[PDB]
Amino acid sequence: INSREVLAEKVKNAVNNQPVTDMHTHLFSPNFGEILLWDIDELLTYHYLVAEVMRWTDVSIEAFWAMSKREQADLIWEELFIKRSPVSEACRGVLTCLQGLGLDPATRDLQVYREYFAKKTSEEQVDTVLQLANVSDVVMTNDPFDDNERISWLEGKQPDSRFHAALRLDPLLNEYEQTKHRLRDWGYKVNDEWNEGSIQEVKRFLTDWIERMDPVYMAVSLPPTFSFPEESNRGRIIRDCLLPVAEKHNIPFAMMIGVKKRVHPALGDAGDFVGKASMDGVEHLLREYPNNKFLVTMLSRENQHELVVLARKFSNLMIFGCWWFMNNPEIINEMTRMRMEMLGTSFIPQHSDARVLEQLIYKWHHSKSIIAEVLIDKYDDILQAGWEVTEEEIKRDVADLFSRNFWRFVG
Amino acid sequence: INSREVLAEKVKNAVNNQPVTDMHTHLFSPNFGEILLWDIDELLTYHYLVAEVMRWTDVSIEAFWAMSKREQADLIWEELFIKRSPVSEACRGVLTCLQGLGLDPATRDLQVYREYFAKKTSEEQVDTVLQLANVSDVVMTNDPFDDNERISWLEGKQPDSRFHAALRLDPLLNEYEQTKHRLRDWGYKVNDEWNEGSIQEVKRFLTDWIERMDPVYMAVSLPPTFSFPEESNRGRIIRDCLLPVAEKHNIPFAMMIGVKKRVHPALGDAGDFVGKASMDGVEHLLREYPNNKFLVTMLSRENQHELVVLARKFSNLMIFGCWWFMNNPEIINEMTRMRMEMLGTSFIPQHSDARVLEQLIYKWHHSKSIIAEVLIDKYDDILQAGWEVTEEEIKRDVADLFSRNFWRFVG
Amino acid sequence: INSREVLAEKVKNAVNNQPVTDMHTHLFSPNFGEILLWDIDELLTYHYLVAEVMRWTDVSIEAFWAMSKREQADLIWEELFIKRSPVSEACRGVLTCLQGLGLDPATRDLQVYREYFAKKTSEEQVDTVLQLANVSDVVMTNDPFDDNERISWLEGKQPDSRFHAALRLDPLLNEYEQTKHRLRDWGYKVNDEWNEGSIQEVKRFLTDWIERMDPVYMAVSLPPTFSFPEESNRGRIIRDCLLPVAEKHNIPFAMMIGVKKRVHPALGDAGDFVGKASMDGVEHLLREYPNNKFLVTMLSRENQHELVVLARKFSNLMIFGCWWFMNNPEIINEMTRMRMEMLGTSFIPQHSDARVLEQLIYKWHHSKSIIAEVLIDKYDDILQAGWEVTEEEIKRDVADLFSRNFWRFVG
Ligand SMILES: O=CC(=O)[C@@H](O)[C@H](O)[C@H](O)C(=O)O
Ligand SMILES: O=CC(=O)[C@@H](O)[C@H](O)[C@H](O)C(=O)O
Ligand SMILES: O=CC(=O)[C@@H](O)[C@H](O)[C@H](O)C(=O)O
Ligand SMILES: [Cl-]
Ligand SMILES: [Zn+2]
Ligand SMILES: [Zn+2]
Ligand SMILES: [Zn+2]
Ligand SMILES: [Zn+2]
Structure with a gap:
């Protein structure tokens, strides 16, 4: 390659043809039912x-x-x-x-x-969409507190090889005072106060589900006020249960920070808002738990640049996607450029967060064109500097961005 | 339209020909005197x-x-x-x-x-400028606490039909302690305490001036530290007087948040600074007063994205313009794109804030070129998705953005 | 200049030919030794x-x-x-x-x-690099608290005419409890107690070093929590010693705000992070010390727009460069555009921060191309307005931005 024109077609084709691993969606394996x-x-x-x-x-x-x-x-x-x-x-x-x-x-x-x-069926639409969207692997959001979903796991159902589990724990971490009673009903003998017993049972809860789902990672969405350390149920659970278990099973911990839940309850799932978070908690976690891996994405536009800089500091931090209100061309562009300029290819530029199967098509089509344009710009800059990029190196870098970096991180 | 070039010409033509309603300026009807x-x-x-x-x-x-x-x-x-x-x-x-x-x-x-x-009179220039800037309607900033402006209204002088009044209340909400002395001198018997008598008289003041001005909305500029609810004169006046009256007359409440007044006193009108505000007070007002309408524009670059998200949550919120330090190409562009990507056409992209008549020419010229560029991109994206936009729909959308959305909101 | 094409040619040439004054680097005159x-x-x-x-x-x-x-x-x-x-x-x-x-x-x-x-000697490579990067003047970072650098100054070393000193004071302002012991070791009789005696000896320390280094300015890098006034060593030393000495000798005070030091100790120099700072302290300093000059650059992306606005308020404030985590194309572009749109040419767009001699080549090459593009856009916009810019005016503007504004400010 020795022309921006030639480079452009080579990059666009590599991006388009690269099978995508969507590391965060709200889709489910067809056999899970109407939940999809x-x-x-x-x-x-x-x-x-x-x-x-x-x-x-x-x-x-x-x-x-x-x-x-x-x-x-x-x-x-x-x-x-x-x-x-x-x-x-x-x-x-x-x-x-x-x-x-x-x-x-x-x-x-x-x-x-x-x-x-x-006319078509679930398993049928899934095949077609995954084909058209060129998605090879989909990571689900599996919440055991959701009856509509827990029922399938207890029935011994298994998602097909194209769908991977991710243990979502918002109810446990953010609503322990109410959720603790549900654990008890499930046989997890947690006590009123935070003692050895409570700790062990919560850890048993996590392990039992890790054993059942074989999740690629455990996850939680957090508010703008997220702090750590913190003498709260969330703070103690993360410290005494989640982190130790995550380390032992070498499972990453995904944190999606910045959502202010239900500012307009009547709107249901459309009633959540956003706020800028402090980086202190994430910084602490990364430094003090070097044996734990963390996947992070933030909701506030104002947290994006500093999150990239934090990634420069800690290799046990992998940042991913342009989440929710960040999933708009204007933001995706500025975010991807800041990320590549300070991290090269050591990050995961996007996820679809698809709630409806067909979305995989537009989510990836809209993002890939922007990412391809960013890549063309960066490749061209080094070509102008006399560097020679091969099509194979391009396909390799593109593979890392859309699939390999994730699997490499979860290990 | 089936080509960007074709689209561009039709979009630019629609934008240039569309009569503009400037919903916020510091201009006055020519018959008001030298204040223009x-x-x-x-x-x-x-x-x-x-x-x-x-x-x-x-x-x-x-x-x-x-x-x-x-x-x-x-x-x-x-x-x-x-x-x-x-x-x-x-x-x-x-x-x-x-x-x-x-x-x-x-x-x-x-x-x-x-x-x-x-070699020209003020009325002549007004016709000239309004024609060149293609501005059909101008919303003024009328402050009943200023002796000079007070004259015009008390004398029963009506403004040119092309100019609309907006009841500005900064002195009342932000300087009650010093303004109450004048309210008394005007017949409004407010006490030194916040009793029923004072509450009623302030309402009377607002009601009387709404009658005399027939404003499209009541407005106030607020500091980065703006909070609500708040146990201060401003907090009590908004809660006990302004909101109730605004709801009864179904007139919007415009809040321009983020200005830090006189950080450099000697510079006069040129000595004001900016600061990021919390979205809490605005969020509270929107949710707790569903029967009130709110027009909002913020001064800090860092408040823009979250303001857009807030508009997604509340339909009684109409965001408008790229205010002051935001009224620069680099910011107008990023703001307009974020707004359209998350709000479609349900917002008011700009206002002039003109303090000098002629400014209407450049304020709108500079802004229309940018807005047109954004529209071209957004239309071309759906055009590329196989959607067909009629030139009539373009004129319709352009009409909403530059005029209809405002009048619709102020009802 | 007729077309944008002609404009781009003259701008690019002027920018490329304009000798650069790099007002902040970590380079040293070659005669200083291997520290370079x-x-x-x-x-x-x-x-x-x-x-x-x-x-x-x-x-x-x-x-x-x-x-x-x-x-x-x-x-x-x-x-x-x-x-x-x-x-x-x-x-x-x-x-x-x-x-x-x-x-x-x-x-x-x-x-x-x-x-x-x-092959080459330090002297030869300096000649080569400075010619290639077209840098006529390099401002160093001279830290009298570093034992090695201190010996050179105490033993009479002087930089050649191409290098200028800048008295760096981080240890004095940020680590005074540890530093006071060293001051005493050097004959500055400061007491453990902060009193008139200590104030005078710290003032004497500053005076002695200003006299020895003939610095273009005194400087310090500050954390995101920087505040002023502040009841602390930094607050007191700045108030009682630095500002009065700086005013007396008419030497500017450079503040590089936003760095959170050693969040990852093991990475050494690669372990610093970033955080948004309040503008309150800078605003205070500018307003209350009208007779002092301040050079400021900030590390957080979120402090950039408001920093520009602050410059609009105070002429004793000169903002400079796209520092560290801001020194990436996406950021350099947005910053440079916001600055020119609100300050015209009254600012210093960039500095290299070069720690390795050859970096001068890429730092200035990458930044000049971006600055050139912004200028072309801005010149083109006024050309479209009917203004006619001459090539001499362009060369003048470019000279101001890359060299004159600095010398003029510190003059
Ligand atoms: O893209 C928006 C969404 O999917 C959110 O509703 C969702 O709650 C969020 O992504 C999450 O995983 O918590
Ligand atoms: O856009 C700059 C201005 O018009 C300000 O001076 C003005 O005070 C502000 O817009 C306001 O209406 O409070
Ligand atoms: O640009 C990155 C650097 O040079 C930093 O390591 C440096 O500490 C910073 O610029 C400073 O002068 O404090
Ligand atoms: Cl911010
Ligand atoms: Zn999600
Ligand atoms: Zn205004
Ligand atoms: Zn941008
Ligand atoms: Zn430096």
């Missing part, structure tokens, strides 16, 4: 769009939740696509999905699009 | 340039204020345009105004530029 | 690359520090250049230096690059 969502109506009722439609429609939130799935979908399509152009990232995403499946957004024929999905 | 500032000398002595010239000139701030308007204008012209290239946004803006008026910056003939304004 | 670091092995072992290589290599940090300079350099070359493409800014910089020296990165022949340096 898919089709155009599910795409249109994605909570991102529920929030956006409420800024326009005169239909009360109560009434909205009272409508059927199809009715909610019809309202959103009309309000966000017909009455106004679907220029938002979330709306754009729905279109990218339709087009990717072979459907044509030009006609705006929602009924015809729907007819497409009605 | 205009001409090249007023543009050159805009406080933005006073701050900039003071970074170069050897002239003391005292000596500067002692100079006549023409002398100050002369100094600023020589210091910021001749001794160094006028590359700053504020300086660039002055040139943009001259050009729009038919004058030629190439000559740098300040004397000739001045001759242009001397 | 140079050659490819030094470039490769720059702490920026030590941090980066530790994110990839299996070699422990202890084993790394135990390796020879050559072995460390071989490791870094293989890990960051061969096993992965050298796309990070720091790695790209190493290549740019190689190319600028006439070597060829295409061969990846590290053994051959090393031969180029095995």
Whole structure:
């Protein structure tokens, strides 16, 4: 390669053809049941769009939740696509999905699009989507406190080889005072106070599930006020239970910091907000637990640059994705550029956070084009400096970014 | 449209031809008197340039204020345009105004530029400028605590139909301790305590001025430390008087948060600074007062992204403009993109904040070019996804952004 | 200048031809000895690359520090250049230096690059590098608390006309409890108690060193928690000694704010982190000490915009460079644009912070190209407004930005 033009095609092709390992989604293996969502109506009722439609429609939130799935979908399509152009990232995403499946957004024929999905099955749509989105591996969010999901694990169900488990623990860490009673009901003899017994039982709880799911990592989403150390249930659990168990099983600990839950409870999953967090807690964890691995992603735009700098300090920290409110072109671009400039290729640029199966298509299509453009710029800079990049080196670097860095980290 | 080039021309045409409603300025109906500032000398002595010239000139701030308007204008012209290239946004803006008026910056003939304004009346210039800037409606900042402005309203003088009033309340909310003495002198018997009597009289004051002004909204500028609820005069006035009255008359409450007043007293209007604010008070107001409408713009760059996320949570929140220190190309661009990507077209991209008539020319010229660029990108992305946008839908979306969204919100 | 194409040509040439005054580096006049670091092995072992290589290599940090300079350099070359493409800014910089020296990165022949340096003397390489990077003046960081540097000064060493001293005081201001003992060891009779006697001896220490080094400014790097006034050694020493001495000798005070030292002790120089600081202390200093001059650069991305706004308020504030974690293309670009949009040309866009002689080549090459682009955009915008910029004015502006603004400020 010795031309930006030539470089551009080589990079775009390597990126496009590179099978993706999506290390954080809200999808489930087909055999887990209806817990796996898919089709155009599910795409249109994605909570991102529920929030956006409420800024326009005169239909009360109560009434909205009272409508059927199809009715909610019809309202959103009309309000966000017909009455106004679907220029938002979330709306754009729905279109990218339709087009990717072979459907044509030009006609705006929602009924015809729907007819497409009605024909196929879950296992069938999964194969097609994973093919079209070029995703080889999907990491789920497995929460044992969720009855709809725990039932499948207790039944001995196993996800197919393309889906990996990740032990989600928000209820345990953030709501211990209520959750402790559920552990007791499950036979985990935790006591009123934090003593040897409570510690051991919570650890047994973690180990039992690690044994059941064989998770690639344990995870938790945290508030902007997250601090560590801390004399709170969360602080003690992390210190006395999670970290020791994680080290023993060499399992990474994923922290998604910055979410302020339910600032608008009526909106349900669309009612969460964001706040800038202190880096002190993460800094402490990284330094004081050198034998533990940490995967981190933050919600606030204002935490992104310093998070990158922290990654420069600690190799036991792997930063990943452009999470939630960060998953917009303007932010993805600035984040990926800051990350590559200070970390080279030693990071995971993105995850889809897909809640609806088809999203894998747009999530990866929208991000890959931006990442490819960033790569082209960086490769070109060193080419201009006289360096010679081979297509094989490109495919290698791209492989690390979209798949290898993750598996290498989880080990 | 089926090509970026084609799209670009149709988008730019739609943006340029769309009549603008400037929902926040410091301009006054021409019949109000000299408070309506205009001409090249007023543009050159805009406080933005006073701050900039003071970074170069050897002239003391005292000596500067002692100079006549023409002398100050002369100094600023020589210091910021001749001794160094006028590359700053504020300086660039002055040139943009001259050009729009038919004058030629190439000559740098300040004397000739001045001759242009001397042969014109204020009403004439108003028609000229509003025409050039394609501004159909101007929202003023009317402060009933200023003796001069108070005259116009008490005399029953109505403003030009193109100008709308906005009840500014900074003295009341931020300086109650000193303002209460004037409220009493005006017939509003507020006590030195916050009893029912005082509460009722403040409401009466607001109610009376809403009747006299028929404002599109009530407004206040707040410091980075703004909090709510709060046991202070401002906190009690907002809770017990402003919100109740605003809800009863269904008029929005505009909050411009982030200004740290007079960090450099000697600079006058040019001595204000900025600070990041907590989103807690705004979040509280939105959630706890669903029957009230809120217009918000923040001064800190670091508050922009989270403000957008907050708008996603509450439909009774309408964010607007790129205020003051945010009114620069680099910031206008990132802000507008973040806003459209997460809010689609459900927001008001800009306002001029013009203190001098002519500024409407450059403020909107400089902002429309950027907004057009963003729209082109967003339209092209969905266009690439197979969606087809009609030129009529473009005019519709452009109308919402530059005018409809505001009037719709103020109801 | 007719077209943007013609404009770009004249701007690029002026920027490239303009001799640079690098107002902050960690280089020393060659006659000072081996403390002046140079050659490819030094470039490769720059702490920026030590941090980066530790994110990839299996070699422990202890084993790394135990390796020879050559072995460390071989490791870094293989890990960051061969096993992965050298796309990070720091790695790209190493290549740019190689190319600028006439070597060829295409061969990846590290053994051959090393031969180029095995010949030359320090004096020759200084002449070579300064000519290539077109740097006419280099400001050093002279720390009288470092035993080695101190001996040179006490024994009469003077830098040649191309190098200027800057009195660095971190140990005095940030570690006074440890430093007071050393002051006493040097004849400065400070008491354990902070009183008039101690104040006078610290003032005498500063005076003696100002006289010995004839520094262009006194400097210190500060933590994100920096505040002023403050009841602490730093607060008292700045108030009682530094500011009065600086005013008396009319010497500016350079504050580099935002570094959190040694968050990862084992990484040595590569173990410092970043944090956002309050602007309160800087605002206070500028306002209350109008007779003192302050040079400021901040480490947090989130402090940049407000720092610019503060410069608009105070002429005794000169902001400079894109420091450390800010010295990446994505950040340099946004910072430089915000600065010019709000300050025109009244600022110092960059400094190299070079710790290794050859870095001057890449630091200035990478920054000049970015600064050139910003200038082209800004000049083009006013050209489109009708203004006509001459090539002489362009050369003047470029001279101000890269050299004149500094000498003028510290004059
Ligand atoms: O992308 C937005 C989401 O998926 C959130 O609703 C979700 O709660 C978040 O990503 C999480 O994993 O906690
Ligand atoms: O945009 C700069 C301005 O107009 C400020 O001086 C003004 O005080 C501010 O916009 C306000 O309305 O409080
Ligand atoms: O640019 C990175 C550096 O030179 C730092 O190591 C250095 O300590 C910093 O610039 C300073 O002068 O304190
Ligand atoms: Cl911030
Ligand atoms: Zn998620
Ligand atoms: Zn205003
Ligand atoms: Zn940007
Ligand atoms: Zn330095």
